[PDB]
DNA sequence: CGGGCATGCCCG
DNA sequence: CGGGCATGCCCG
């Protein structure tokens, strides 16, 4: 009955985890992940790679879904969408999250919650310990009429073809002009005032 | 043959001038006019009163047209429009400038230049030295996908019913959250660095 | 209200 | 590139 998808971490029986590349905090890095904050800082319309780690191999037909929700309680019931400017300038223009480099991407609009998601087949790592998906976020967190400075969580779910939830993980995202600057500011604020 | 409307001041044979109320520079004033900069600072979707002064009375049927153009050479050929966010949230939604409080307003989209303008009948001052029109600017200068931080000029023309230009004046506009702050900053910069 | 944090971006 | 100006707005 809830229209708000769950965000609670569920590593599940396959030992599903996410992982992220190390990139550092130079002012101009295109993306950078903060383990302390469990938060990706990235630039709009640029690659944001996410690694899928599993302990046990999921069954054939498993899918990987990504969906954004607002992190703050007061905004969690509002659907996360592209702002009108970037909508106008495969993926429907209203979708915030895209996957690049995949021939089997599917973009979904839920008929009951109206929430957007993007799904690709799960592929096991090559003869490697993880699989990488290249996500793109098509608005800045600050975009007026879209995210409007509100932080989001991206929820990644591993689902079998029957729709069973096999695993769930999430991470906070800030899409911004200067990921390295902003990661440094938020980590310093965590240390001084968190 | 030009698609860029003239901005050159033409006081003309009726002695046409604009005038503005004095309001000062408190951080929260809703609008404030800088004589030194010939520039109105105002807030979006709030009243921006403009006075029409004439020495001689225009003929019956005279009209008052307002149009925005970009002030900087590199942007002057681009039509000034409402941004997509405020377009979606009598006046066509794409028009930046509205007139409030007038039963005879007309909104025009030029069939050749595609430029927008808003026109009201000229009314002589009451048995007073000027007539006031209440304009509204429906985007901030900073709106993404609209003015995008580019300064505009508003061009006010006094036209007879046959279309003769009787007079023309213009003023720069900044639509912003804090007119009083921003007028003070720009006047100080004029003094220190202009 | 006024102080000052925010965050895209600097081109007259 | 990194410094710092910009400019809406501060609500976990
Ligand atoms: C943002 C992205 C990059 O450009 C490399 C470093 C960090 N992340 C993975 C690869
Ligand atoms: C973050 C900062 C940089 O280092 C370049 C990209 C965006 N911003 C301006 C230049
Ligand atoms: C912006 C507007 C106001 O609110 C009064 C002072 C200045 N201007 C005219 C009236
Ligand atoms: C300019 C400043 C003010 O004084 C109020 C209006 C907008 N901004 C925040 C509050
Ligand atoms: C998990 C991830 C790594 O750490 C490298 C790059 C691709 N996968 C295998 C080797
Ligand atoms: C010109 C203008 C003024 O200065 C006041 C207000 C209205 N008009 C007449 C009196
Ligand atoms: Zn956007
Ligand atoms: Zn706007």
Numbering used by the authors:
A (entry chain A), B (entry chain A): 94 to 182, 188 to 225, 227 to 293
Manuscript text:
In addition, we present the structures of MQ bound to DNA complexes of the rescued double mutant R273C/S240R, referred as R273C/S240R-DNA-MQ, and two types of MQ-modified wt complexes referred as wt-DNA-MQ (I-III) and wt-DNA-MQ (P1). MQ-C124 is well defined in five structures: R282W-DNA-MQ, R273C/S240R-DNA-MQ, and wt-DNA-MQ (I, II, III). Significant local disorder at the turn of S7/S8 (residues V225, G226, S227) is observed in wt-DNA-MQ (I) shown in d, associated with the presence of two alternative Cys-bound MQ enantiomers (MQr in light green and MQs in dark green), and two alternative conformations of E224 and of residues S99-Q100 from the neighboring p53 dimer. One E224 side chain forms a salt bridge with R267 and a hydrogen bond with S99 from the neighboring dimer, shown also by the other structures, whereas the other E224 side chain forms a hydrogen bond via a water network with the carbonyl oxygen of MQs bound to C229. In the p53-DNA complexes where the two DNA half-sites are contiguous and hence the two dimers are parallel to each other, MQ-C229 conjugates are located at the inter-dimer interface. MQ-C277 conjugates were observed in all structures of mutant and wt p53-DNA complexes. A local conformational change in L1, relative to that of the MQ-free complexes, leads to different stabilizing contacts between S121 and the backbone of the 5′-end nucleotides without affecting the nearby K120 interactions with G3 and G4 bases. In these structures, no direct MQ-mediated hydrogen bonds with the DNA bases are observed, except for a water-mediated hydrogen bond between the MQ carbonyl oxygen and G3 base observed in the three structures of wt-DNA-MQ (I, II, III) represented by structure (I) in Fig. 9d.
The human p53 tumor suppressor is a 393-residue protein that in response to cellular stress, acts as a transcription factor by binding as a tetramer to a wide range of DNA response elements, activating various events including DNA repair, cell-cycle arrest, senescence or apoptosis. Mutations in the p53 gene were observed in more than half of human cancers. To uncover the structural basis of rescuing p53 mutants by MQ we investigated by X-ray crystallography high-resolution structures of the core domains of mutant and wild-type p53 bound to MQ in the absence and/or the presence of their DNA response elements. These studies reveal diverse binding modes of MQ to specific cysteine residues that stabilize the proteins and their interaction with DNA.
